[PDB]
Short mmCIF file of C-alpha atoms and ligand atoms in Angstrom, two decimals:
data_model
loop_
_atom_site.label_atom_id
_atom_site.label_comp_id
_atom_site.label_asym_id
_atom_site.label_seq_id
_atom_site.Cartn_x
_atom_site.Cartn_y
_atom_site.Cartn_z
CA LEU A 1 36.28 -7.24 -86.24
CA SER A 2 32.56 -7.66 -84.85
CA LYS A 3 30.34 -8.21 -88.16
CA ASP A 4 31.06 -9.44 -91.13
CA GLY A 5 27.91 -9.53 -93.17
CA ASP A 6 24.55 -10.17 -90.66
CA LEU A 7 27.20 -12.71 -88.66
CA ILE A 8 27.45 -10.21 -85.60
CA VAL A 9 29.00 -11.45 -82.61
CA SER A 10 27.04 -12.29 -79.67
CA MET A 11 24.66 -13.55 -82.08
CA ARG A 12 22.22 -17.01 -81.42
CA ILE A 13 23.52 -19.51 -84.20
CA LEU A 14 23.43 -23.50 -85.36
CA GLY A 15 26.07 -24.85 -85.65
CA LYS A 16 28.39 -28.27 -86.99
CA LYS A 17 30.06 -30.20 -83.91
CA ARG A 18 32.57 -33.54 -84.93
CA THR A 19 29.89 -35.62 -84.69
CA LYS A 20 28.56 -34.11 -87.64
CA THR A 21 25.71 -33.70 -85.04
CA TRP A 22 24.34 -29.56 -85.20
CA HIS A 23 24.39 -27.51 -82.40
CA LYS A 24 22.66 -24.18 -80.62
CA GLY A 25 24.70 -22.04 -79.71
CA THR A 26 26.53 -18.03 -79.78
CA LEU A 27 28.60 -16.75 -82.45
CA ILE A 28 31.73 -15.28 -79.94
CA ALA A 29 34.12 -13.71 -82.46
CA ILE A 30 35.39 -13.55 -86.34
CA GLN A 31 38.49 -14.61 -87.93
CA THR A 32 40.48 -13.70 -90.70
CA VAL A 33 41.97 -16.43 -91.61
CA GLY A 34 43.95 -15.54 -95.69
CA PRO A 35 41.78 -15.01 -97.95
CA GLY A 36 38.95 -15.02 -95.54
CA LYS A 37 37.05 -15.72 -92.10
CA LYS A 38 35.95 -17.88 -89.26
CA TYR A 39 33.39 -18.34 -86.99
CA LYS A 40 34.18 -19.05 -83.12
CA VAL A 41 30.89 -20.31 -81.70
CA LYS A 42 30.30 -21.46 -78.15
CA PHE A 43 27.40 -24.72 -78.35
CA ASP A 44 24.45 -24.33 -75.55
CA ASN A 45 25.64 -27.54 -75.01
CA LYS A 46 29.68 -27.66 -73.51
CA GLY A 47 31.92 -27.54 -76.35
CA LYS A 48 33.94 -24.68 -78.89
CA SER A 49 34.45 -24.59 -82.53
CA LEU A 50 36.17 -22.61 -85.32
CA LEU A 51 34.37 -23.20 -88.11
CA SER A 52 33.99 -21.88 -91.29
CA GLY A 53 30.66 -20.01 -93.00
CA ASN A 54 29.53 -22.75 -94.27
CA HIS A 55 29.96 -25.17 -90.88
CA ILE A 56 27.32 -22.77 -89.29
CA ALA A 57 23.72 -21.31 -89.54
CA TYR A 58 21.19 -18.96 -88.71
CA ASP A 59 18.62 -19.84 -86.38
CA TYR A 60 15.89 -18.80 -88.16
CA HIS A 61 13.48 -20.40 -90.74
CA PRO A 62 14.04 -19.48 -94.22
CA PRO A 63 11.96 -18.25 -96.32
CA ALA A 64 10.11 -21.42 -98.95
CA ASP A 65 10.73 -19.15 -101.91
CA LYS A 66 14.70 -18.79 -101.54
CA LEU A 67 15.03 -22.40 -100.94
CA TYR A 68 16.05 -23.80 -104.86
CA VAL A 69 17.44 -27.84 -105.85
CA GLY A 70 20.35 -26.96 -104.36
CA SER A 71 20.12 -25.43 -101.51
CA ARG A 72 22.74 -26.10 -98.71
CA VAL A 73 20.60 -26.41 -95.86
CA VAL A 74 20.04 -28.05 -91.81
CA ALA A 75 16.97 -29.89 -91.17
CA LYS A 76 15.15 -31.50 -88.41
CA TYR A 77 15.37 -35.94 -88.17
CA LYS A 78 13.41 -37.79 -85.29
CA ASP A 79 15.35 -40.42 -84.85
CA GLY A 80 11.81 -41.45 -82.91
CA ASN A 81 11.57 -39.33 -79.54
CA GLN A 82 14.97 -38.05 -80.38
CA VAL A 83 15.20 -34.76 -83.01
CA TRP A 84 18.59 -34.18 -83.89
CA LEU A 85 20.02 -30.99 -86.45
CA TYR A 86 21.85 -32.21 -89.66
CA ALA A 87 22.82 -31.49 -92.45
CA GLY A 88 21.49 -31.72 -96.63
CA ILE A 89 20.93 -30.56 -99.93
CA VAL A 90 17.04 -29.91 -100.63
CA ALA A 91 15.82 -32.45 -103.61
CA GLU A 92 12.84 -31.56 -103.89
CA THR A 93 11.24 -28.04 -103.07
CA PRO A 94 7.18 -28.19 -102.46
CA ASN A 95 4.34 -29.12 -105.12
CA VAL A 96 1.17 -31.05 -105.56
CA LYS A 97 3.03 -34.60 -105.51
CA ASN A 98 4.30 -34.06 -102.55
CA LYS A 99 2.06 -32.84 -100.26
CA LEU A 100 3.63 -28.50 -100.47
CA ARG A 101 7.30 -30.28 -98.84
CA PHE A 102 10.78 -30.10 -98.80
CA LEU A 103 12.78 -33.25 -99.50
CA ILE A 104 15.89 -33.24 -97.48
CA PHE A 105 19.55 -35.29 -99.12
CA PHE A 106 21.35 -35.74 -95.95
CA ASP A 107 25.52 -36.51 -95.95
CA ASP A 108 24.92 -39.75 -94.82
CA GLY A 109 22.25 -40.15 -97.57
CA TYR A 110 18.98 -40.74 -96.14
CA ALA A 111 16.24 -38.96 -97.35
CA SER A 112 12.92 -37.62 -96.09
CA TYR A 113 10.32 -34.65 -96.78
CA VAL A 114 10.50 -32.16 -93.76
CA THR A 115 8.58 -28.93 -94.27
CA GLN A 116 10.24 -24.49 -94.09
CA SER A 117 9.84 -25.18 -90.38
CA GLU A 118 11.89 -27.90 -90.00
CA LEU A 119 14.67 -25.35 -91.44
CA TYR A 120 17.78 -23.92 -91.71
CA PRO A 121 20.23 -21.96 -94.00
CA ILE A 122 23.86 -22.52 -94.14
CA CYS A 123 25.34 -19.01 -93.74
CA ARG A 124 28.05 -19.49 -96.40
CA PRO A 125 27.40 -22.03 -98.59
CA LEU A 126 30.23 -23.32 -101.16
CA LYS A 127 29.44 -21.74 -104.45
CA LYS A 128 29.03 -25.64 -105.79
CA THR A 129 26.29 -26.46 -102.22
CA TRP A 130 27.80 -29.78 -102.89
CA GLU A 131 30.93 -29.82 -102.35
CA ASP A 132 31.57 -29.96 -98.45
CA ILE A 133 29.80 -33.61 -98.31
CA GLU A 134 32.01 -35.36 -96.94
CA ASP A 135 30.86 -38.71 -97.55
CA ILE A 136 32.09 -39.20 -102.00
CA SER A 137 29.38 -41.26 -102.52
CA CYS A 138 26.95 -39.20 -101.32
CA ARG A 139 28.83 -35.63 -102.93
CA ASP A 140 28.63 -37.95 -106.52
CA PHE A 141 25.42 -38.76 -106.08
CA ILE A 142 24.34 -35.07 -105.38
CA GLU A 143 26.06 -34.33 -107.95
CA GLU A 144 24.80 -36.52 -110.79
CA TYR A 145 21.28 -35.73 -109.18
CA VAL A 146 21.32 -31.58 -108.87
CA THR A 147 23.46 -31.53 -112.33
CA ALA A 148 20.64 -33.77 -114.82
CA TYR A 149 18.31 -32.35 -112.06
CA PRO A 150 14.71 -31.77 -113.59
CA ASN A 151 15.66 -35.30 -115.21
CA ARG A 152 14.99 -37.49 -112.27
CA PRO A 153 14.42 -41.13 -114.08
CA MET A 154 12.51 -42.80 -110.72
CA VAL A 155 11.03 -46.55 -110.72
CA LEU A 156 7.17 -47.45 -109.90
CA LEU A 157 6.03 -49.50 -107.15
CA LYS A 158 3.22 -50.21 -105.52
CA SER A 159 2.22 -51.09 -102.02
CA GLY A 160 2.69 -54.76 -101.46
CA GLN A 161 4.93 -55.21 -104.24
CA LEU A 162 8.34 -57.29 -103.38
CA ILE A 163 11.11 -56.44 -104.17
CA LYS A 164 14.49 -56.72 -103.12
CA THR A 165 16.23 -53.80 -102.45
CA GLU A 166 20.02 -53.44 -101.05
CA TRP A 167 21.67 -53.41 -97.80
CA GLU A 168 25.23 -52.96 -96.52
CA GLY A 169 26.06 -54.84 -99.99
CA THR A 170 23.32 -57.95 -99.42
CA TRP A 171 19.65 -57.85 -102.25
CA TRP A 172 17.64 -58.73 -99.48
CA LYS A 173 13.38 -59.58 -99.59
CA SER A 174 10.93 -56.94 -99.03
CA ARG A 175 7.35 -55.48 -99.56
CA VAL A 176 6.81 -51.83 -100.80
CA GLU A 177 4.36 -51.17 -97.64
CA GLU A 178 3.45 -47.39 -98.68
CA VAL A 179 4.82 -45.24 -101.29
CA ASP A 180 4.86 -40.50 -100.41
CA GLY A 181 5.83 -38.22 -103.13
CA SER A 182 9.28 -39.47 -104.22
CA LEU A 183 9.70 -42.04 -101.19
CA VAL A 184 8.77 -45.43 -100.63
CA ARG A 185 8.33 -47.40 -97.38
CA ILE A 186 10.07 -50.63 -97.52
CA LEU A 187 9.72 -53.58 -95.11
CA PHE A 188 12.41 -56.04 -94.92
CA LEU A 189 11.13 -58.92 -94.33
CA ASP A 190 13.56 -60.97 -92.83
CA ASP A 191 14.13 -58.51 -89.23
CA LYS A 192 11.28 -56.92 -90.04
CA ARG A 193 12.85 -53.49 -89.61
CA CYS A 194 11.14 -50.84 -92.15
CA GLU A 195 12.98 -47.32 -94.15
CA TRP A 196 11.81 -44.32 -96.69
CA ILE A 197 13.82 -44.61 -99.73
CA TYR A 198 14.09 -42.48 -102.88
CA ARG A 199 12.61 -44.24 -106.00
CA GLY A 200 15.48 -43.49 -108.09
CA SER A 201 17.74 -45.14 -105.33
CA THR A 202 19.91 -48.64 -107.24
CA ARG A 203 19.14 -50.27 -103.87
CA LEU A 204 15.89 -50.81 -105.48
CA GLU A 205 15.86 -54.46 -107.20
CA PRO A 206 13.52 -52.39 -110.65
CA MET A 207 16.15 -49.40 -110.25
CA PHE A 208 18.98 -51.03 -110.14
CA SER A 209 18.04 -53.35 -113.42
CA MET A 210 16.52 -49.77 -115.62
CA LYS A 211 19.66 -48.42 -115.24
CA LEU B 1 53.49 -54.77 -99.88
CA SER B 2 50.25 -57.05 -98.79
CA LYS B 3 50.92 -58.28 -95.54
CA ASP B 4 51.35 -56.33 -91.80
CA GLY B 5 50.58 -58.61 -89.08
CA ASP B 6 47.75 -60.86 -89.28
CA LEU B 7 45.99 -57.82 -91.55
CA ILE B 8 46.56 -59.16 -95.12
CA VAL B 9 45.05 -57.62 -98.64
CA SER B 10 41.58 -60.00 -98.78
CA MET B 11 40.63 -59.98 -95.87
CA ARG B 12 37.63 -58.61 -94.30
CA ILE B 13 37.47 -55.62 -92.24
CA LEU B 14 35.53 -53.11 -90.54
CA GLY B 15 35.95 -49.60 -91.64
CA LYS B 16 35.29 -46.67 -90.24
CA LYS B 17 33.14 -43.54 -92.71
CA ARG B 18 33.69 -40.63 -93.27
CA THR B 19 29.94 -40.39 -91.54
CA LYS B 20 31.46 -42.23 -88.29
CA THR B 21 29.83 -45.15 -88.89
CA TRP B 22 31.30 -48.58 -89.70
CA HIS B 23 30.79 -51.00 -93.09
CA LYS B 24 32.00 -53.61 -93.96
CA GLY B 25 34.35 -54.14 -96.38
CA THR B 26 37.68 -55.22 -98.40
CA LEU B 27 41.36 -55.21 -97.23
CA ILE B 28 42.27 -54.56 -101.09
CA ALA B 29 45.82 -52.74 -100.58
CA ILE B 30 49.03 -51.13 -98.01
CA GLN B 31 50.15 -47.87 -98.39
CA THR B 32 53.15 -46.81 -96.94
CA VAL B 33 52.37 -42.97 -95.54
CA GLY B 34 54.89 -41.61 -93.46
CA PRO B 35 56.08 -43.53 -90.74
CA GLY B 36 53.32 -45.62 -91.09
CA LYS B 37 50.88 -47.43 -93.12
CA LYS B 38 47.59 -47.09 -94.08
CA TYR B 39 44.63 -49.40 -95.60
CA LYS B 40 42.80 -49.06 -98.72
CA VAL B 41 39.06 -50.56 -98.02
CA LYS B 42 36.68 -51.33 -100.75
CA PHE B 43 33.15 -51.20 -99.10
CA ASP B 44 30.47 -54.18 -99.29
CA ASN B 45 27.74 -50.79 -99.87
CA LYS B 46 29.43 -48.72 -102.16
CA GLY B 47 32.84 -46.31 -101.60
CA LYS B 48 36.91 -46.41 -101.18
CA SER B 49 38.24 -45.55 -98.41
CA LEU B 50 42.63 -45.60 -97.44
CA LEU B 51 42.59 -45.62 -94.15
CA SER B 52 44.89 -45.54 -90.88
CA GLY B 53 45.20 -48.27 -88.51
CA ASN B 54 42.94 -46.76 -86.19
CA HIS B 55 40.20 -46.41 -88.41
CA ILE B 56 39.07 -50.68 -88.69
CA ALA B 57 38.61 -53.51 -86.51
CA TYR B 58 38.43 -57.05 -86.98
CA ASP B 59 35.39 -59.33 -88.22
CA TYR B 60 35.16 -61.33 -84.98
CA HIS B 61 33.52 -60.74 -81.82
CA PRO B 62 36.55 -60.19 -79.70
CA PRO B 63 38.00 -63.08 -76.31
CA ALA B 64 36.42 -61.20 -73.57
CA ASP B 65 39.67 -62.09 -71.79
CA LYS B 66 41.15 -59.89 -74.31
CA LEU B 67 38.96 -56.16 -74.38
CA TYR B 68 39.36 -54.38 -70.32
CA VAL B 69 38.51 -50.48 -69.45
CA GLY B 70 40.00 -48.47 -72.13
CA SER B 71 39.59 -50.64 -74.63
CA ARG B 72 38.70 -49.17 -78.06
CA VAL B 73 36.04 -51.32 -80.03
CA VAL B 74 33.80 -50.93 -82.22
CA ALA B 75 29.45 -51.68 -81.24
CA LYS B 76 26.06 -51.91 -81.78
CA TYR B 77 23.88 -49.24 -81.80
CA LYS B 78 19.91 -50.59 -81.75
CA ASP B 79 17.42 -47.55 -82.84
CA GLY B 80 15.17 -50.14 -82.58
CA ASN B 81 15.18 -51.64 -86.05
CA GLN B 82 18.17 -50.14 -87.16
CA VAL B 83 21.69 -51.87 -86.38
CA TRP B 84 24.83 -49.45 -86.94
CA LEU B 85 28.03 -50.03 -86.00
CA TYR B 86 29.50 -46.63 -83.70
CA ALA B 87 33.69 -46.54 -82.48
CA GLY B 88 33.83 -46.52 -78.57
CA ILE B 89 35.70 -47.70 -75.22
CA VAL B 90 34.93 -50.13 -72.95
CA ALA B 91 34.06 -48.53 -69.64
CA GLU B 92 33.44 -51.31 -67.91
CA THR B 93 33.90 -55.86 -68.12
CA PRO B 94 31.42 -57.45 -67.12
CA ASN B 95 30.12 -58.40 -63.33
CA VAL B 96 27.75 -59.32 -61.59
CA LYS B 97 26.12 -55.23 -60.34
CA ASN B 98 26.07 -54.63 -64.64
CA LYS B 99 24.65 -58.52 -65.37
CA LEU B 100 27.73 -60.00 -67.03
CA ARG B 101 27.79 -57.08 -69.68
CA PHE B 102 30.69 -54.55 -71.28
CA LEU B 103 28.93 -50.05 -70.82
CA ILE B 104 30.48 -48.62 -73.77
CA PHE B 105 30.97 -44.84 -73.66
CA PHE B 106 30.64 -44.34 -77.06
CA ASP B 107 32.94 -41.43 -79.47
CA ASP B 108 29.74 -38.90 -79.56
CA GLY B 109 29.19 -39.14 -75.53
CA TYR B 110 26.32 -41.81 -75.83
CA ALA B 111 26.63 -44.85 -72.96
CA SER B 112 25.21 -47.96 -73.41
CA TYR B 113 25.42 -51.90 -72.38
CA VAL B 114 26.16 -54.92 -74.71
CA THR B 115 27.46 -58.59 -74.90
CA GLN B 116 30.71 -59.69 -76.65
CA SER B 117 29.29 -60.49 -79.66
CA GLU B 118 28.18 -56.76 -80.21
CA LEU B 119 32.08 -55.43 -80.51
CA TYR B 120 33.84 -55.36 -82.98
CA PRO B 121 38.46 -54.20 -81.78
CA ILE B 122 39.98 -52.01 -83.48
CA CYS B 123 42.46 -53.70 -85.23
CA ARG B 124 45.65 -50.30 -84.79
CA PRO B 125 44.08 -48.85 -81.38
CA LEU B 126 46.69 -45.97 -80.49
CA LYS B 127 49.04 -46.04 -76.89
CA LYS B 128 46.51 -43.55 -75.43
CA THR B 129 43.36 -45.13 -76.45
CA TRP B 130 40.74 -41.74 -76.48
CA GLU B 131 43.64 -39.77 -78.47
CA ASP B 132 41.07 -40.49 -81.69
CA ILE B 133 38.37 -39.09 -79.85
CA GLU B 134 36.99 -36.11 -82.27
CA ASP B 135 34.55 -34.32 -79.87
CA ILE B 136 37.01 -32.51 -77.09
CA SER B 137 34.60 -32.52 -73.95
CA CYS B 138 34.20 -36.38 -75.02
CA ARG B 139 38.21 -37.24 -74.86
CA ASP B 140 38.42 -35.08 -72.93
CA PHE B 141 35.32 -37.44 -70.47
CA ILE B 142 37.52 -40.18 -71.96
CA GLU B 143 40.69 -39.35 -70.64
CA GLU B 144 39.83 -39.06 -67.84
CA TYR B 145 37.71 -41.88 -66.56
CA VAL B 146 40.33 -44.65 -67.75
CA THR B 147 43.41 -42.55 -66.36
CA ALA B 148 41.46 -42.59 -63.21
CA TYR B 149 39.69 -45.46 -63.41
CA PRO B 150 38.35 -47.88 -60.84
CA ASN B 151 37.85 -44.65 -59.54
CA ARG B 152 34.08 -44.89 -60.59
CA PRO B 153 32.66 -41.30 -59.17
CA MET B 154 28.93 -42.36 -59.56
CA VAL B 155 25.05 -40.88 -58.62
CA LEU B 156 23.20 -43.18 -56.53
CA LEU B 157 19.59 -42.62 -57.78
CA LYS B 158 16.46 -44.38 -57.23
CA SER B 159 13.43 -44.84 -59.39
CA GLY B 160 10.37 -42.12 -59.32
CA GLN B 161 13.32 -39.60 -57.73
CA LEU B 162 12.32 -36.02 -59.61
CA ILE B 163 16.10 -34.31 -60.18
CA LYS B 164 16.86 -32.15 -63.07
CA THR B 165 18.54 -33.54 -66.23
CA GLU B 166 20.74 -30.81 -68.23
CA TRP B 167 20.12 -31.13 -72.66
CA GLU B 168 21.59 -28.80 -74.27
CA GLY B 169 22.94 -25.58 -72.07
CA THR B 170 18.91 -26.16 -70.92
CA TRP B 171 18.43 -28.05 -66.78
CA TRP B 172 14.97 -29.99 -67.48
CA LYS B 173 12.68 -30.94 -64.62
CA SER B 174 12.39 -34.95 -65.14
CA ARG B 175 12.07 -37.97 -63.12
CA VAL B 176 14.30 -41.18 -62.93
CA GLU B 177 12.00 -43.83 -64.58
CA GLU B 178 14.79 -47.23 -64.50
CA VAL B 179 18.61 -47.88 -62.61
CA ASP B 180 20.14 -50.42 -64.88
CA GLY B 181 23.55 -50.91 -63.83
CA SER B 182 25.97 -47.57 -64.18
CA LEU B 183 22.69 -45.70 -66.36
CA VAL B 184 19.68 -44.67 -65.25
CA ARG B 185 16.71 -43.36 -67.73
CA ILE B 186 16.07 -40.10 -67.50
CA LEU B 187 12.00 -39.47 -68.58
CA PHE B 188 11.98 -35.43 -69.44
CA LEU B 189 8.70 -33.94 -68.05
CA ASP B 190 7.82 -30.99 -70.62
CA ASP B 191 7.93 -32.89 -73.52
CA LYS B 192 7.73 -36.41 -72.17
CA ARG B 193 11.67 -37.80 -74.03
CA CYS B 194 13.50 -40.97 -72.36
CA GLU B 195 17.53 -41.05 -72.43
CA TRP B 196 19.71 -43.51 -70.07
CA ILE B 197 22.07 -41.75 -68.68
CA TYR B 198 25.62 -42.42 -67.31
CA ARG B 199 25.79 -42.03 -63.77
CA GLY B 200 28.75 -40.39 -63.83
CA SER B 201 27.76 -37.96 -65.94
CA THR B 202 27.38 -34.50 -64.62
CA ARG B 203 24.20 -33.58 -66.79
CA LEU B 204 22.43 -35.14 -63.68
CA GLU B 205 22.18 -32.08 -61.98
CA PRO B 206 23.05 -33.93 -58.45
CA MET B 207 26.53 -34.77 -60.12
CA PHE B 208 27.72 -32.44 -61.42
CA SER B 209 26.53 -31.42 -57.50
CA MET B 210 28.38 -33.62 -56.54
CA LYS B 211 31.38 -32.16 -54.17
C1 FNC C 301 20.56 -37.82 -91.18
N1 FNC C 301 20.92 -39.21 -90.71
C2 FNC C 301 20.18 -40.14 -90.84
C3 FNC C 301 20.69 -41.55 -89.75
N2 FNC C 301 19.76 -42.48 -89.96
C4 FNC C 301 19.16 -42.61 -91.15
N3 FNC C 301 20.47 -43.13 -91.83
C5 FNC C 301 20.13 -44.24 -93.37
C6 FNC C 301 20.44 -43.93 -94.25
C7 FNC C 301 20.56 -45.26 -95.66
N4 FNC C 301 18.86 -45.80 -95.02
C8 FNC C 301 19.35 -44.69 -93.92
C9 FNC C 301 18.52 -44.92 -93.13
O1 FNC C 301 16.82 -45.73 -92.61
N5 FNC C 301 18.36 -43.55 -91.70
C10 FNC C 301 17.80 -44.30 -90.16
C11 FNC C 301 20.78 -40.82 -88.69
C12 FNC C 301 21.74 -40.03 -88.68
C13 FNC C 301 22.09 -39.67 -87.02
C14 FNC C 301 23.72 -40.09 -86.95
C15 FNC C 301 23.58 -38.27 -85.69
C16 FNC C 301 23.19 -38.47 -84.64
C17 FNC C 301 21.76 -39.07 -84.89
C18 FNC C 301 21.96 -39.54 -85.90
C19 FNC C 301 21.27 -38.95 -89.36
C1 FNC C 302 26.75 -43.67 -80.40
N1 FNC C 302 25.86 -43.29 -81.06
C2 FNC C 302 24.29 -42.46 -81.02
C3 FNC C 302 23.46 -41.33 -81.29
N2 FNC C 302 22.66 -41.50 -79.87
C4 FNC C 302 22.60 -41.23 -79.07
N3 FNC C 302 23.36 -40.54 -78.83
C5 FNC C 302 23.71 -39.77 -77.11
C6 FNC C 302 24.19 -38.69 -76.81
C7 FNC C 302 23.99 -38.35 -74.85
N4 FNC C 302 22.87 -38.69 -75.62
C8 FNC C 302 21.73 -39.21 -76.74
C9 FNC C 302 21.19 -40.65 -76.78
O1 FNC C 302 20.23 -40.78 -76.34
N5 FNC C 302 21.78 -40.99 -78.13
C10 FNC C 302 20.04 -41.71 -78.54
C11 FNC C 302 23.16 -41.83 -82.77
C12 FNC C 302 23.54 -41.90 -83.65
C13 FNC C 302 24.22 -42.17 -84.58
C14 FNC C 302 25.47 -42.33 -85.17
C15 FNC C 302 24.78 -42.19 -87.31
C16 FNC C 302 23.89 -42.85 -87.28
C17 FNC C 302 23.28 -43.53 -86.62
C18 FNC C 302 23.10 -43.39 -85.14
C19 FNC C 302 24.91 -43.44 -82.85
#
């Protein structure tokens, strides 16, 4: 083979490394594997991988109209000075409440608002898009979320409010610093760490109790 | 069965999640699979996994006089405020030149110096400790390094030195800001990012060019 749909050897493409971050390279071969095909990527950053269609993504930003709740995407994550690419699911499309942004639920349970220009469409997602989410607890939340979807139980929080927030099986004293749409920035008082958290997460005590 | 050496059911343990970070939990079972045992971990946070012995670690910091170049460990990784647990290989043990710290080569190719109180020992490492490193470029680097060991080819670098440093397939104009033992802090100029890098890495042009 040399083409499969719009996947064509020598094209630029994004590929998921075994580390779970995604990296730019070139599609150097396509390979038939039984019923379907696999896609061989040579990474700009030196390695090579033979990948299924749901572990590559196009090197362009999608049009924010083909994005729906449940869409499989790769999104930029800004860990301070570095920027990484990581997979997730579109949880919210742009609107007035979220200030015309996309809410992304990443495959490791993190959540963040991003713009169309920080997103890449996965080439061949699965029919049920959450089924290649490796972490089972995250996969299950996504499946419940997308299935209930328009239903989205959240907790009302106000800046300064004192609550307990879960982290690593412990409940910690914390304070609400800020609310941005469906997220809340939480300050943990013991170690002064901050963390953005979906307002429907049971890690927030008022959400834990409501349930 | 409920015992295997000092792996005993109801003990506290660290287990490796499918996201590649490690989390505290409880050993709730031991299961025979093929020729060996797997270990069922219920995580403090949420979730359960049936893990092989090299994907669990003890809850305590190891006796410094038990750690060697090649030891398979879990180390604390500090993103400023956040702390994660991530698997790696001891590349150096404490000495005068490294300010009595352990140098850790993590499984995703990062390197940092840590103290004994930031380490946890993997319960059942492979005979060749690198053989469960998933990223093949990192694996091959660590095999060569551990196999070559007291041989430690590095480049010498001075504060202020201008060099090219690789990042994602591109060589960027950069500067040596700091030397700390076997690591150097590089300032990428085009976009101002700082990054710690092992002085034996071929991402440093002088090393890439060493012959
Ligand atoms: C998306 N994902 C975000 C992770 N960061 C994060 N995950 C959770 C989950 C709950 N809370 C937090 C939280 O606060 N943070 C900061 C870091 C991760 C990463 C993987 C590999 C290389 C660099 C980065 C990428
Ligand atoms: C050890 N590993 C380090 C990664 N960070 C990193 N890796 C490389 C590789 C070359 N250069 C850098 C570099 O500069 N950084 C900052 C982040 C990663 C992580 C995974 C999941 C959740 C939070 C964190 C842990």
